[PDB]
Write a protein that binds this ligand. Structure first.
Ligand SMILES: Cc1cc2nc3c(=O)[nH]c(=O)nc-3n(C[C@H](O)[C@H](O)[C@H](O)COP(=O)(O)OP(=O)(O)OC[C@H]3O[C@@H](n4cnc5c(N)ncnc54)[C@H](O)[C@@H]3O)c2cc1C
Ligand SMILES: Cc1cc2nc3c(=O)[nH]c(=O)nc-3n(C[C@H](O)[C@H](O)[C@H](O)COP(=O)(O)OP(=O)(O)OC[C@H]3O[C@@H](n4cnc5c(N)ncnc54)[C@H](O)[C@@H]3O)c2cc1C
Ligand SMILES: COC(=O)c1ccccc1S(=O)(=O)NC(=O)Nc1nc(C)cc(C)n1
Ligand SMILES: COC(=O)c1ccccc1S(=O)(=O)NC(=O)Nc1nc(C)cc(C)n1
Ligand SMILES: CCCOP(=O)(O)OP(=O)(O)O
Ligand SMILES: [K+]
Ligand SMILES: [K+]
Ligand SMILES: [Mg+2]
Ligand SMILES: [Mg+2]
Lengths: 596, 593
């Protein structure tokens, strides 16, 4: 038994457990139900507290913080609307496997189930969007629940967890000693089984003639992931493609880089995947934005599997994602990085793959990320902004972190930025939450105070959570907000152009003056609309001390390409064509009655 | 038998038709991938108007505002995933306050459900505890049916929110086969017995009190029949926060609002009443105070079989849920009041009762520290002044609010006289409700003067909707009582946590520059001398306008009943005590506050 907490309130015990869980930052917003805990963390030296203007912001900040630091993001909000306001961030963290512990205040246990003031069944509401949740029934179990929450959030596939805290529990004084284990954080047959699958994976890899590494976020859940990935890639001469969430795990400057695959992935990455005899999936879940039409996915690997000379190998940590989308030949369970390390010595060094590399190189010259570049008098092109910013940012020599909103700017940031470092791309992929950009950048900056943190946002996405601009000033986070303003919900207008004969239904919102907004919010505001001024503005943007927002007026109705949609296979993509763009433009003006 | 007027139409087009059949004139929403088939079908629709916010939460609260002001259900149309999760707060809010709302959420194709698909969420599971009912349309054939069930459920019994999940493949699907025409178109003695006994118990009451809530506002004749009964039987009327506007506060029988921050007279009358006639109210914990101390005299009158509590409630689940009642009249309150009217004996006077009540009103008025030469503007003063200035316009006035002290002061110091003119978040108490609700109300009543009395912290929650007001053409008047703090929380911290202000002070943006950046006029007032002129220019402005009034900080809302206190054990205002508290606050915060 442990009696060291006897005499303390639940709130004080909460405060105490934070330092035991190595928590240095908490994102939250005060409220009645959670007051006992706030009174306990008042002036606390155990951690920095970050206050947003809206709980959703606290949630996204916590995600960005977790994505940038590798530590779970901690949220502390009140009951009722406080808790319902964090459902989106939880669903978002759940989709992208982000470690987060959400503490929600709750009405007194005696008022639960009486439709009490600011009462919500948060445990019920968040059941499907948390790896686990619970309502603390007594102060005696507060330490146990906190410890279980942190452990569950950061293990297996990371994810969000919620802990409901009744006000009478946090205000209550602990009058009983409690088990020592509940107050302290944290099979040979199985090991042999994993080692057996590792040997099978090695044998299969040593047999491959056209292998491809399909890499995702999982490789970033271990400090040595990128390093071991590169070792394997070099040792067996295997080209590497990453998902949107795997960007930064592999140096794109390396000859063996295939760039991103998927719906809007590089044509070369998609073609390599469709023609590979062996796909080595590492920390990726084969989501529907990556596979294209599943029945058309990886035909050559499927053919090789039927002939027992290839197929798909999957390094997955969660049983839920093993053989959930496609049949795999070998599943290596557990942490990918760890398993890559164990397999390495069994992989035969390869001298070269001239044919495979030659084929891949022909595709690279044939299918670059082409787009309609600037022309005299034309508006600035969004893709051009990303390419230029990437260069300017990288040249500073500083550690760079990029967050984004959801939409075309997001895809263009993914395609045209040159990814080289682990944990430098923080974006909402699974749930695709517009508004993620700003708050995520604020959280990321708190995690890495010395990094140059850039939010490449869209105008519609930015509007969702622009109130957090004042939070950036109050928090002292010198974030660089970039708004690629096309005065439209681009992602949606693109789909409307393609599948709904150019009928833009409610996808054009009236924007506020972003520069005046920035100034009203307390930061520097910059705007650029002329090609000749882009370079200077990007320069000023990056070198400005303090938070700053830069709006770039960009061309409208520009589609993201290449694109694989509907029943198309990864190799049946739409490619950029200047002539077609011009024809589609004319067709658009007619159909919209000249409105767009 | 079978109907074919929809055959050949996509689910989206059917949705468009159903809005017309349901007499929907306004839809609030935000487009997204999964819901595109529907947005395509309503593209340039003349069946109704569309209002676009910057965030789905805005659409939700706008729809609530619309519903509260119009009496019609608020219709929401959003996409799957984040679109759906972003409307959970508004649904929980509507669920708490019984607001009719039909939320349509796009969903990924039925062939993608259960595969952790792009932007997929278990919306039906998430919103279960926040909706009276929800469902996922499995085929286009059942779309007309599900829509009709949704609107019916949302507008029946106690109004509330409902959600209809729409898979993209279902809304894109074309109706091939005809569907039942029925699915395409939109004891009794116990009640009468209760009405009779209720009438008798009332005719026997010596110190009756009408405890009125939002229920009376759910019927067009509610306020009228309430007045009739009040006059006929000469019964004093007190209303909850959600009942404000259902009774003319200019009438001598008005006891004003009761509860945690209700008028002392109202609370005293309730504690001394021998009979409490609860009409469309649910005895929430913000009204009853310490439950065991609630209505002590009514309980005694009940033990002596000469009084007690009569409850006109439409929801059986809310009867005898908080306190045991003697008589329960199930069904619509307004309807049952009309049936009981004749059985009520016309009382000519209640001298003794009204005498006691009148001396309480003279001894316990909404007192507060008024302005002094050189001091800051007082919050309560702004409300009283604006109340008159707004009234003198002669226009129909609708008031919305955020959550906190400004909300309570607005409730207390405004003179309520018209039904459906006070739109505030009470059950869930959602900060940020003010602006989007106002915008929604303005849409419901284009000719009305809509004023949002907000708090600085509350305003910050959803201020992005300012640009939405401009795009929607809603000339809302936004008033911000800026005390640069989370007033209601700092009050509790001052009272229960020895002035330890833990993270209750957020850094505010420049509200005037913000308003201008958003496309509307911005005004600011700091001096007492400019208040009157500013308030006049404020309500006189043609388009949407924002007015920030710098008010005094750390000002407590009184009277107050909290903790284990009874409605009669309230904390009354005292000028000397406020000065002593100010000195204590300074010494404890090192002069910071
Ligand atoms: C507009 C839009 C367009 C998009 N277009 C694309 C596109 O074209 N291409 C694309 O790639 N994505 C795209 N996405 C993102 C996409 O939805 C998915 O979020 C992303 O592809 C998922 O990548 P992931 O599988 O690598 O990561 P996750 O979804 O996080 O999945 C990681 C997988 O790794 C496993 N794993 C986790 N940790 C470990 C560990 N330690 N050891 C071993 N295994 C582990 C997990 O449990 C899981 O199965 C788009 C999103 C949006 C919003
Ligand atoms: C900061 C803050 C402070 C607050 N302070 C106070 C305070 O001091 N005093 C106070 O009064 N409130 C206060 N509240 C509001 C409070 O939480 C409750 O929302 C409000 O008191 C509920 O009033 P109501 O019962 O009238 O309406 P509802 O909560 O909507 O309940 C209505 C009841 O009427 C029934 N009914 C509905 N329609 C009909 C019909 N057609 N026929 C018959 N019955 C029907 C319902 O089903 C239900 O039981 C506060 C809220 C906040 C945010
Ligand atoms: C949050 O409500 C409950 O938890 C809650 C719910 C039902 C009963 C009792 C409580 S309570 O008595 O434990 N706490 C409060 O009532 N708190 C509170 N109330 C107001 C009006 C403003 C602020 C800041 N805090
Ligand atoms: C919303 O997703 C699904 O419903 C969804 C989910 C899984 C599979 C298929 C779909 S889909 O093929 O029926 N629709 C889309 O994929 N839509 C879409 N995708 C993007 C990237 C941007 C926009 C605007 N719409
Ligand atoms: C519970 C919220 C408080 O903050 P806000 O600034 O909105 O209002 P007030 O300060 O009037 O209580
Ligand atoms: K790239
Ligand atoms: K009043
Ligand atoms: Mg845009
Ligand atoms: Mg305030």
């Amino acid at each position: 038994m442990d009696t060291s907490f006897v005499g303390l309130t639940g709130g004080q015990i909460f405060n105490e457990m934070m330092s035991r869980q190595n928590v240095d930052t908490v994102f939250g917003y005060p409220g009645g139900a959670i007051l006992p805990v706030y009174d306990a963390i008042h002036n606390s030296d155990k951690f920095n507290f970050v206050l947003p203007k809206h709980e959703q912001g606290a949630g996204h900040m916590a995600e960005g913080y977790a994505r940038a630091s590798g530590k779970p993001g901690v949220v502390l909000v009140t009951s009722g609307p406080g808790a319902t306001n964090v459902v989106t961030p939880m669903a978002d963290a759940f989709a992208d496997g982000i470690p987060m512990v959400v503490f929600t205040g709750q009405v007194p246990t005696s008022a639960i189930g009486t439709d009490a003031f600011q009462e919500a069944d948060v445990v019920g509401i968040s059941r499907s969007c948390t790896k686990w949740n619970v309502m603390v029934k007594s102060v005696e179990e507060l330490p146990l629940r906190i410890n279980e929450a942190f452990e569950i959030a950061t293990s297996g596939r990371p994810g969000p967890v919620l802990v409901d805290l009744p006000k009478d529990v946090t205000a209550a004084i602990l009058r009983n000693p409690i088990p020592t284990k509940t107050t302290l954080p944290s099979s040979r047959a199985q090991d042999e089984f994993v080692m057996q699958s590792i040997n099978k994976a090695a044998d299969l890899i040593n047999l491959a003639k056209k292998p491809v590494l399909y890499v995702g976020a999982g490789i970033l859940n271990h400090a040595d992931g990128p390093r071991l990935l590169k070792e394997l890639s070099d040792r067996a001469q295997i080209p590497v493609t990453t998902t949107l969430q795997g960007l930064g795990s592999f140096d794109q400057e390396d000859p063996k880089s295939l760039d991103m695959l998927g719906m809007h992935g590089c044509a070369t990455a998609n073609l390599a995947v469709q023609n590979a005899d062996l796909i080595i999936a590492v920390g990726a879940r084969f989501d529907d934005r990556v596979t294209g039409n599943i029945s058309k996915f990886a035909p050559e690997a499927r053919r090789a599997a039927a002939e027992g000379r290839g197929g798909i190998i999957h390094f997955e940590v969660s049983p839920k994602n093993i053989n959930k989308v496609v049949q795999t030949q070998i599943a290596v369970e557990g942490d990918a990085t760890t398993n890559l390390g164990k397999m390495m010595s069994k992989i035969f060094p390869v001298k070269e793959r001239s044919e495979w590399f030659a084929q891949i190189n022909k595709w690279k010259k044939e299918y670059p990320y082409a787009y309609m570049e600037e022309t005299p008098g034309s508006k600035i092109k969004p893709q051009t902004v990303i390419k230029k910013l990437s260069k300017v940012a990288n040249d500073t020599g500083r550690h760079v972190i990029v967050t984004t909103g959801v939409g075309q700017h997001q895809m263009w940031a993914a395609q045209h930025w040159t990814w080289r470092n682990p944990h430098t791309f923080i974006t909402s992929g699974g749930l695709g939450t517009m508004g993620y950009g700003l708050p995520a950048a604020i959280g990321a900056q708190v995690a890495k105070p010395e990094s140059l943190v850039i939010d490449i946002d869209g105008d519609a996405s930015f509007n969702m959570t622009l109130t957090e601009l004042s939070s950036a000033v109050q928090a002292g986070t010198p974030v660089k907000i970039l708004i690629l303003n096309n005065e439209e919900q681009g992602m949606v207008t693109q789909w409307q152009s393609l599948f709904y004969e150019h009928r833009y239904s409610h996808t054009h919102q009236l924007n506020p003056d972003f520069i005046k907004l920035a100034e009203a919010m307390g930061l520097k505001g910059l705007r650029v609309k002329k090609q000749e001024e882009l370079d200077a503005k990007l320069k000023e943007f990056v070198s400005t001390k303090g938070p700053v927002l830069l709006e770039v007026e960009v061309d409208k109705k520009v589609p993201v390409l290449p694109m694989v949609a509907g029943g198309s296979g990864l190799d049946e993509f739409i490619n950029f064509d200047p002539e077609v763009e011009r024809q589609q433009t004319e067709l658009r003006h007619k159909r919209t009655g000249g409105k767009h």
